[model samples]
Target: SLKLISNDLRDGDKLPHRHVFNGMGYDGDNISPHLAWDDVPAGTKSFVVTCYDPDAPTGSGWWHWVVVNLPADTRVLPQGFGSGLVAMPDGVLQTRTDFGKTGYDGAAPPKGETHRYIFTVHALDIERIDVDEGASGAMVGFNVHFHSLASASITAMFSE
Candidate 1:
């Protein structure tokens, strides 16, 4: 089975303040956590990484981050990789999140409540998702679902 792990955060753990959104009324670093994965199923040609908040007050939930077209040989993503201040591999598409910009847009649920942040790694059967750089998270998700061969995830919690 596929396995997902993160050095910066753990499943069922509280997210670090540095990984919280620092814009749009929120306040924090807005950095993505360091992540590594292994045991991709056979036939995987690429990978997709996403951070979703299913408990967001929004009717359709919230997507904090979405990355696609990662080479199949990829095994790790260092901290701050999605900061948009660092360079990523050519051809890897980092799409816009609900925050209205591309790159990591960390957790920022409403006050007085906690939200779950699901960080997922999808092992894809195709080399790339047919979406543009400005594609919405839902669009990338739609493509991910259809091309996924296996997946793994780690869930963390956050509150304002």
Candidate 2:
């Protein structure tokens, strides 16, 4: 399948807007970055999105974001769409990530070090996965295993 992605962040790709960060003082919003995709291959009925930090302090890395059951033909999600009062497209639900939150969380590694944030979109055969609000990243991975038909990804890195 073909995947098209754009950072298009107003502040540049290196740092997501401050609003996306968690309420921490280091300007780490922990909000999911603005992402959109197109040119998905035919036969794709649904999609799942995941963000992984391969360079996290943990040995196995971390999952910062997870969203599933995104309707096909729907592309583009605004920055901070799930945060605040803004509503995301219907039929799409974000699962709780490793941060224990159910929406996008911006990257905030220790100072003076850089980390890689990987955003992946999975095209699925199933219309949706059966999961709840508090599902772990591993459970989402399990769902992706059975439901995914094809996958695409857009990656970026952040530090400080």
Candidate 3:
């Protein structure tokens, strides 16, 4: 099994305000959290990281973040990497989130509602996925699931 750790995510804990969505009248900075992983299964050639909110009102859960094609040797995504404040390694791919844009989008559920933000790191058997930034989260997710060897996650909760 794989292990996931994050500076901003702790299973069942409240997410920090800094990671909240900055648009839609929200005030938080929308910073993507720092994440690191370990105990990768053998033969992992790539990685996929995603943040999903299953509590969203939509029939399908909201995909707040999705990153693909991370090299096997890569183990950490520094704070704000998804916000474009930090640089991604060459060749890494970030696909579209539910926000209708590429790169990371943060939590912004409706008022008085609590949502779970599950940040997952997936170890994949393939070195790269063909999906580009224009692809939807579900599309990238499909590819991730097809090639994933193992996966781990840490969920953080947030409310108005």
Candidate 4:
């Protein structure tokens, strides 16, 4: 079984304000947190890391980040790895999140309601996904689900 961990936040804990959405009329640093994983299943050829908000008001919920094609040996993403300002590993492709950007967009739930942010890492059987950077999170997820051999996740909560 895969084991996902984070240095910036813990499962079921409140996320720091820096990792929350600060744009689009909200206030936050909008930074992606540091993440690492281990115990990948054998034959894993690549990885997909995603951040999702299942508590969003939208029926479909929200996708804050979707990163595809991480190399098989990759196990850690430094803080701000998805900020669009930092350099990611070669061949890694980040698709659009619900925020309409092609990189990590932090959490920004409605005021007075706490929201859960689920960060997941999918161990895949392929070296790369066929989608482009403009693809939606759902599109990447569709491909992930098809090729995934195992997965792990961590959850953190946030509120305005």
Error of 3 at 83 (Å): 0.7
lDDT of 2: 0.72
Better of 2 and 4 by TM-score: 4
Q: Considering summed lDDT, which 10 consecutive residues are worst modelled in model 1?
A: 21-30
The global C-alpha lDDT for each of the candidates, from Candidate 1 onward, is 0.90, 0.72, 0.90, 0.91
- Against the hidden reference, what TM-scores do the models get? 0.96, 0.84, 0.96, 0.96
Model 1, 1-160: lDDT tens digits are: 9999999999999998889989767888988999999888999999999999999988999999999999989999999989966798988989989888889988877768899999999999999888887899999988987898999999999987
In the range 1-160, model 2's lDDT, one tens digit per residue, is 5574755442224555453356554655545556777777777788888878889888878887888888877576666655644676777788888788887777767768787777778888777688877888899899899877777776666777
**Candidate 3, residues 90-160: lDDT per residue as tens digits?**
99978898899988888988989999999999999999899879999889888987898999999998998
Candidate 4 residue 94 C-alpha distance from true site, Å? 0.8
- Candidate 4 C-alpha lDDT tens digits along 1-160: 8999998989999988889887766788989999999999999999999999999999999999999999999999898889966787899988998988888888888868899999999999999999989999899989987999999999999886
Candidate 2's C-alpha runs over 4 A off are: 7-13, 17-20, 28-31
Candidate 3 displacement at residue 103 in angstroms: 1.0
Candidate 1 global TM-score: 0.96
